[PDB]
Design a protein around this nucleic acid. Sequence first.
RNA 1: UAGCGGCGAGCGAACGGGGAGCAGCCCAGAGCCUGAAUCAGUGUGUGUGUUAGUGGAAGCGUCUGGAAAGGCGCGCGAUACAGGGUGACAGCCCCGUACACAAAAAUGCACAUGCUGUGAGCUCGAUGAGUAGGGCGGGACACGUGGUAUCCUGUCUGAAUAUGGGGGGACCAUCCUCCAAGGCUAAAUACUCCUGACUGACCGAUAGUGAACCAGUACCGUGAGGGAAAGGCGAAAAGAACCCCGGCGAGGGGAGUGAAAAAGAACCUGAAACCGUGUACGUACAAGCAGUGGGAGCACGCUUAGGCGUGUGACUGCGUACCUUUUGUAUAAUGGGUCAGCGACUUAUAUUCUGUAGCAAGGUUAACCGAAUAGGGGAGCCGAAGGGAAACCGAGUCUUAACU
Lengths: 144, 201, 27, 117, 64
Amino acid sequence: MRLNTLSPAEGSKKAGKRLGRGIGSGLGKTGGRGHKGQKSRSGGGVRRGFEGGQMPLYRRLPKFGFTSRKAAITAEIRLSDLAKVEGGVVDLNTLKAANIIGIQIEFAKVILAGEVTTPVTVRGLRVTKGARAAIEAAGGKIEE
Amino acid sequence: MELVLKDAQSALTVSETTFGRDFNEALVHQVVVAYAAGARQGTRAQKTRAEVTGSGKKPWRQKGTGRARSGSIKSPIWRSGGVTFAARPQDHSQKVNKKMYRGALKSILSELVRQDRLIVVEKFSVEAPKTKLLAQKLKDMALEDVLIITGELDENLFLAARNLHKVDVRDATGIDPVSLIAFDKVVMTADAVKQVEEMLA
Amino acid sequence: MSGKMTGIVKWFNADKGFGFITPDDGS
Amino acid sequence: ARVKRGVIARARHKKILKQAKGYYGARSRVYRVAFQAVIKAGQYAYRDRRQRKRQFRQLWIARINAAARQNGISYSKFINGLKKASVEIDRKILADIAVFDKVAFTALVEKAKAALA
Amino acid sequence: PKIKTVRGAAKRFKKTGKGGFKHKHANLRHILTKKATKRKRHLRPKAMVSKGDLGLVIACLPYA
RNA sequence: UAGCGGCGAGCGAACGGGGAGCAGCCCAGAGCCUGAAUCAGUGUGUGUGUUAGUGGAAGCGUCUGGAAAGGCGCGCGAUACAGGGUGACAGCCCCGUACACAAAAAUGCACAUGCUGUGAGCUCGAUGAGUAGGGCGGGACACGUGGUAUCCUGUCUGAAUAUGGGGGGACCAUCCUCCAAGGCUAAAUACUCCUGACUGACCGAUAGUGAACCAGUACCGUGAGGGAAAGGCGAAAAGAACCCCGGCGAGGGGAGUGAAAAAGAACCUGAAACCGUGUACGUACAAGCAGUGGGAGCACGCUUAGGCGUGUGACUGCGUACCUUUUGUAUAAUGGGUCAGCGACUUAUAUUCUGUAGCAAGGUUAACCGAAUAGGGGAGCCGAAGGGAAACCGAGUCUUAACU
Ligand SMILES: [Mg+2]
Ligand SMILES: [Mg+2]
Ligand SMILES: [Mg+2]
Ligand SMILES: [Mg+2]
Ligand SMILES: [Mg+2]
Ligand SMILES: [Mg+2]
Ligand SMILES: [Mg+2]
Ligand SMILES: [Mg+2]
Ligand SMILES: [Mg+2]
Ligand SMILES: [Mg+2]
Ligand SMILES: [Mg+2]
Ligand SMILES: [Mg+2]
Ligand SMILES: [Mg+2]
Ligand SMILES: [Mg+2]
Ligand SMILES: [Mg+2]
Ligand SMILES: [Mg+2]
Ligand SMILES: [Mg+2]
Ligand SMILES: [Mg+2]
Ligand SMILES: [Mg+2]
Ligand SMILES: [Mg+2]
Ligand SMILES: [Mg+2]
Ligand SMILES: [Mg+2]
Ligand SMILES: [Mg+2]
Ligand SMILES: [Mg+2]
Ligand SMILES: [Mg+2]
Ligand SMILES: [Mg+2]
Ligand SMILES: [Mg+2]
Ligand SMILES: [Mg+2]
Ligand SMILES: [Mg+2]
Ligand SMILES: [Mg+2]
Ligand SMILES: [Mg+2]
Ligand SMILES: [Mg+2]
Ligand SMILES: [Mg+2]
Ligand SMILES: [Mg+2]
Ligand SMILES: [Mg+2]
Ligand SMILES: [Mg+2]
Ligand SMILES: [Mg+2]
Ligand SMILES: [Mg+2]
Ligand SMILES: [Mg+2]
Ligand SMILES: [Mg+2]
Ligand SMILES: [Mg+2]
Ligand SMILES: [Mg+2]
Ligand SMILES: [Mg+2]
Ligand SMILES: [Mg+2]
Ligand SMILES: [Mg+2]
Ligand SMILES: [Mg+2]
Ligand SMILES: [Mg+2]
Ligand SMILES: [Mg+2]
Ligand SMILES: [Mg+2]
């Protein structure tokens, strides 16, 4: 093992195209660009969604809906995340200390995803039905 | 994992996942390349046609004359023109993940064990800061091209090793994979082993 | 002399040419 | 880095200019003409490796037709005689015998006539 | 620099679970008394973007 | 992202979080104690720099060679094997380097202190009016007048004033928070005409500054302004005494120096185009992309004569250049006088896919700290749950009064 015995893995390094260096390279005079277009031009090309002058899809189609600011401050919690806190009690401040939901969060639900194997007191959070059954089966105590 | 010592002919218990790991060459090659790219300074530049000293005047008119069309004397097809894709000062440093860096060190330290390029002693001191004393000690150890890792800051050893190009002396924190490879033998103090094993889990 | 060549190029083209020499509009 | 390409382009031009020896004028002196002439020479050589096999067969046939008419039979009767006599001698060898050993060619003719009669 | 989202397409399309995009139908903004109720009823619900014109949306919406 | 926006092209935050750095004060005013904090200036003193500098280790023999620093032997130094020079590549030849020191004088920065000035603290007050706000017209805020808060103000106006007022994105009410219409203030931040040291997967004379050279010169232009080309004898000039032809020439032949003069100043190496001298072969009854396949003869070498090579090439079959653009070019379509040198899919940041590698329901850090490619740092980002415009529900959800 010296510096002149190392060699990388197979397929790691691929050579990369070099346009405009002869016939045999394949990428000859035009370099994958064809002939006499706008696309073959330097900097040429059309912008996103341009269909010719046809009305693009993002303007044929209507806008809909609005954006809820409250959704940004809500969060969903796995059952598998309940063990990552300490003390066996689950609050917002506990989850934020465990770096699960984030600081600006003011609302959280617990969702049947994953599974928990320990009694955990849930306090001040919404709980789904399957998470309520799984918590109460593992010994939990859902409160407010 | 047990490392026999050179001088007192004792053993030293280490982690086998650290000093008996199989050699992952592609990982080590990635890390050694990124180290040598991190050393790379990247200080160069050329001038574009924007940056060439000149004037933005057409050397001749567009038509009528028999010559080719031209718009600028700074053109990268002219003599003393610009460079077409003139370079800028760029940073060639690569990211290496932490677990990939430690996987590489655990690989090549395992390989130096399997190649018997690793020597472990209890202590490695030179009394006075003299290169004559250090060369005598390494001749008595039958060593010429060596890296010497010490778990302490020994100044007499640093000074006595500063003039010898075959010899380099590091702290256990300041070890690098390319130097663990570029040197023929590596001498580790047993304390430096304990620190390296602790850092590398 | 390529500086006397500067004259050469700079103004044996700035002589500007007179023009076509056939009164013909191919019209 | 600035790769300076004088050595490579010189040796690349001299590989062509060596192949263009004997050519008239700039075809042996000038890379632009010589390269254009070397390629055509490779084209002709590819072509005339095929045409060699035609032209010698044509020569052999004309010599057999002459020597057979010297022995009083045409080529088309003579090949048909040797096919019906199963003689699988190719017409290189028949032209060689027609030049150097006319007795054996006469014997081949009489074998072919006996194969036709 | 970062890519900028085409904000009209961001107001017109939403990414679903498997990566497809939902969108509102057209023809349901005015001129509605002459259209059959069956047509409108089949235009109220959101539809998925087809496979052909899904590439231009992804190009316009790189950030989902 | 939220938003703004012919809701187009595009513009694009903030709250909040992590960090670098952190410093607070004064007048709108009287007193009381009086010089009290601090700052400024000016002296002195001390320290630390700067502006000249000093010392600074250790090698000989032999071989080749013009010349040793090279080779082969045998030693020595090293807190100095950074670098450069020396007749070829020098740790020990020189200059230096590591390290150790050094300033009559001037000056910077710190402290300290003297002097000068400066006021400190306590009490009771006071609390910045053509101002805020408003109307009109504009501008700035990510916010294009929109439902548009807030800021500025050209114009017309115009408050209350601590029981008061401003803001919390039209607006009102409640609540919270702050006190405008007077000022000062270090740091972290930005840059480099210039100086010093060092560095480079930067260039090496058509490159790199326009400029390696008496270059912003020569030259051009009325002028502003534009703006070049051009490096190398040799280790050392030892740069050719003298002789000869020649015009008391140029230039050259000798001689001489030198390792070398096919290193002689038009000077390292000296390619190609281009132009010549010499030799071999062919060529003056013969028609065309000039070659190719065959092939006689001639000349020349080798050779066991064996016949191969090499050069030429009488004659002969076939055979209308290259590029580009084109339905399609020998095309009488474009382009190129030739050579040599340069000359065109890059770079940065985002994103997706593939491959590869690491960890794996987890993966990963950025800024920054750190002497430092380590380690720390998990702020955050992506992912493991979605549906719905949304509230919301949740392995389901939406639609719908409800779904077979
Ligand atoms: Mg192709
Ligand atoms: Mg083209
Ligand atoms: Mg076309
Ligand atoms: Mg095209
Ligand atoms: Mg362009
Ligand atoms: Mg139209
Ligand atoms: Mg967090
Ligand atoms: Mg102009
Ligand atoms: Mg120039
Ligand atoms: Mg240039
Ligand atoms: Mg790190
Ligand atoms: Mg180079
Ligand atoms: Mg020639
Ligand atoms: Mg409607
Ligand atoms: Mg000295
Ligand atoms: Mg010395
Ligand atoms: Mg030499
Ligand atoms: Mg006030
Ligand atoms: Mg106002
Ligand atoms: Mg208002
Ligand atoms: Mg106004
Ligand atoms: Mg007003
Ligand atoms: Mg206000
Ligand atoms: Mg409000
Ligand atoms: Mg104020
Ligand atoms: Mg230059
Ligand atoms: Mg040169
Ligand atoms: Mg003048
Ligand atoms: Mg003379
Ligand atoms: Mg010359
Ligand atoms: Mg030389
Ligand atoms: Mg020369
Ligand atoms: Mg020549
Ligand atoms: Mg003749
Ligand atoms: Mg003749
Ligand atoms: Mg003719
Ligand atoms: Mg032949
Ligand atoms: Mg062309
Ligand atoms: Mg045409
Ligand atoms: Mg075509
Ligand atoms: Mg046409
Ligand atoms: Mg044709
Ligand atoms: Mg013609
Ligand atoms: Mg033509
Ligand atoms: Mg044309
Ligand atoms: Mg032409
Ligand atoms: Mg990519
Ligand atoms: Mg990958
Ligand atoms: Mg369903």
